[PDB]
């Protein structure tokens, strides 16, 4: 069954496009054009962290919004302190390329992982001596790109061999397995209830996932190129995605389609990492042309520019209370913006 | 009291900074070698008391566009090959013409005719390199023709920031080529070229 199934799948996808067109009676910009914008919001470099050797690929804030975990490629996870510009712990490895890093929602465990397929969990208690791998989660067959802690007991690992899986620590095996994708998976994000989560895939298809379902709820095939950036809007309902085709298609789960496309004419480069603020109005995106252009959520205007770095940015986190934004670029510096 | 905890924080900061100084010493003594044709094969060895951590890739899903991009900090990409040859030419062109591989000089190895490349008969053969004895001149012409094909794909918009090095199949030539890449990168630092 391939020909009639192909025709039926094409007809049903056209029915989905027609339902999205019927829901799309008007665009979001034409109905939110009446909103008076805040205006040009500039920022200023406040701190400059100097403790790195290779490029910085990933960072992650804490729930206390005071500490952050930096992932370099020399093999050293360095815990930085924000408001006292100092360091807390330096976590070494036997490998080099640390493609992901995560922080616990209670502040007790730090994850890592790269091409070596060893998702190590480092405790933040240090009873007997220094930091140490508590348990390892080596079960994938490709690589590891992004992982985020749900709680202190389990963590989902977006892998590169198309298999996404939730991993309990003490079992050392797959709790559940999500293989709905076709291509590579770069990044994910977490809703504030820590139950629903999405997955940014490299086939222009964002998939809504869930733990209790064991199966994908929704699929957003809106982009044109590969996706390297994805993040939730802070209400837990909408989410923004970043691709390499110089667009930022704003999606929403309950609206079944896209909302706004950030296609600027003077930008012919990709988008690295996106995040929202505490309100969600400041679209904080990481571009490829050596700056982080601040975009408006509802008016699509460049409210500012963050060009304090000298190389390509790769990660952009926002604190849980809207205190600071530290962008980690490939210049081995951590410029904190306020 | 802020004073005691701040002094303990300063002491821990100085300890981690001396650890980072030792890491900076051992990392500037560290040279990396990506090898392509656990999850990674870290092959550690030293040549003339110089560290060369060679890294090979094994069981990986080979959509390479998302995991090559974490290799701009490497000193030399070793690209050994032996249809497979045309896909190797296309992969070498994709590595050479990437946006973030402009400062990575690629060391190229060869190994291993008339059906895959019918344009072989219209080639002018230089006698600049002395061949090894006991070799067929037709096979020698084909080998240097594959070298010249990789060199013309290299010099087709090479941008001057990185250069290829075709070779034929030891480790001493790898050491000489790493010295070559380090010296050319430092001459581009001092802008003498």
């Amino acid at each position, epitope marked *: 069954e391939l020909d009639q199934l*192909r025709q039926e799948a094409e007809q049903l*996808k056209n029915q989905i496009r027609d339902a999205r067109k019927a829901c799309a009676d008007a665009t979001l910009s034409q109905i939110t054009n009446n909103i008076d914008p805040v205006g040009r919001i500039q920022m200023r470099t406040r701190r400059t962290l100097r403790g790195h050797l290779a490029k910085i690929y990933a960072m992650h804030w804490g729930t206390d919004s005071r500490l952050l975990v930096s992932a370099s490629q020399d093999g050293k996870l360095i815990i930085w302190d924000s408001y006292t510009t100092n360091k807390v712990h330096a976590i070494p490895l036997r490998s080099s390329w640390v493609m992901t890093c995560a922080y616990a929602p209670s502040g007790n465990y730090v994850a890592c992982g790269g091409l070596d397929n060893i998702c190590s969990i480092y405790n933040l208690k240090t009873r007997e001596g220094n930091v140490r791998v508590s348990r390892e989660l080596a079960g994938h067959t490709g690589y590891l790109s992004c992982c985020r802690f749900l709680d202190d007991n389990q963590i989902v690992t977006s892998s590169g061999d*198309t298999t996404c899986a939730l991993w309990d620590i003490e079992t050392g095996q797959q709790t559940t397995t999500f293989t709905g994708h*076709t*291509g590579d998976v770069m990044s994910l994000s977490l809703a504030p209830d820590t139950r629903l989560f999405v997955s940014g895939a*490299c*086939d*222009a*298809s964002a998939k809504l996932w869930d733990v209790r379902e064991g199966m994908c709820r929704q699929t957003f*095939t*809106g982009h*044109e*190129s*590969d996706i390297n950036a994805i993040c939730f809007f802070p209400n837990g309902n909408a989410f923004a995605t970043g691709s*390499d*085709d*110089a667009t930022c298609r704003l999606f929403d789960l309950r609206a079944d389609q896209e909302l706004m496309t950030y296609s600027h004419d003077n930008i*012919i*480069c*990709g988008i690295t990492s996106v995040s929202f603020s505490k309100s969600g109005r400041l679209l904080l995106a990481g571009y490829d042309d050596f700056n982080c252009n601040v975009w408006d959520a509802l008016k699509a205007d460049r409210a500012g520019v963050l060009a304090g770095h000298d190389n390509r940015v790769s990660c952009l986190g926002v604190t849980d209370d809207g205190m600071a934004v530290a962008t980690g670029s490939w210049d081995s510096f951590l410029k904190i913006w306020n | 009291d802020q004073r005691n905890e701040e002094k303990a924080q300063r002491e821990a900061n100085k300890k981690i900074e001396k650890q980072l100084q030792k890491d900076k010493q051992v990392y500037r003594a560290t040279h990396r070698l990506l090898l392509l044709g656990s999850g990674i094969f870290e092959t550690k060895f030293q040549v003339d008391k110089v560290n060369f951590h060679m890294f090979d890739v094994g069981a990986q*899903r*080979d*959509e*390479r*566009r998302k995991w090559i991009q974490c290799f701009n900090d490497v000193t030399a990409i070793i690209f050994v090959v032996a*249809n497979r040859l*045309q*896909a190797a*030419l*296309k*992969l070498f*062109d*994709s*590595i050479w*013409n*990437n*946006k973030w591989l402009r400062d990575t000089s690629v060391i190229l190895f060869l190994n291993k005719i008339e*059906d*895959y*490349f*019918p*344009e072989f008969a219209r080639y002018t053969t230089p006698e600049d390199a002395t061949p090894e004895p006991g070799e067929d001149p037709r096979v020698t012409r084909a080998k240097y023709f594959i070298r010249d094909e990789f060199l013309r794909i290299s010099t087709a918009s090479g941008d001057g920031r990185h250069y290829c090095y075709p070779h034929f199949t030891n480790i001493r030539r790898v050491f000489n080529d790493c010295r070559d890449i380090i010296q050319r990168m430092h001459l581009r630092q001092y802008e003498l070229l």
Partner: nanobody
Amino acid sequence: QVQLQESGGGLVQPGGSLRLSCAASGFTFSNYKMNWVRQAPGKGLEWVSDISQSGASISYTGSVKGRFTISRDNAKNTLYLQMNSLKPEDTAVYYCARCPAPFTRDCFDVTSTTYAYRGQGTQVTV
């Protein structure tokens, strides 16, 4: 979603020319360097030819140099491949593929581990 449709197919005699139009939509055609990838029975995927965004950078596989002709239509967003001087060993599934990133030249569509931006493919039996 990048929908990709092709044209042609069926049993053809060795030596007769046949057009290969790549019916593509849903994306900006003038911002990507699309290409062709064939898959022979008993052989892995291999690159055929390409054309750039402007139309100047045109290359070919070393075995089919000059015998094939690639052309793109910028206005009507399709890719027109023309087969000439056919050979019975050159038959394969001609996938209309697209390189993933805009305004660049690197392409990683030769990998057979389900690169999900290739076409649905039409068998042209020579």
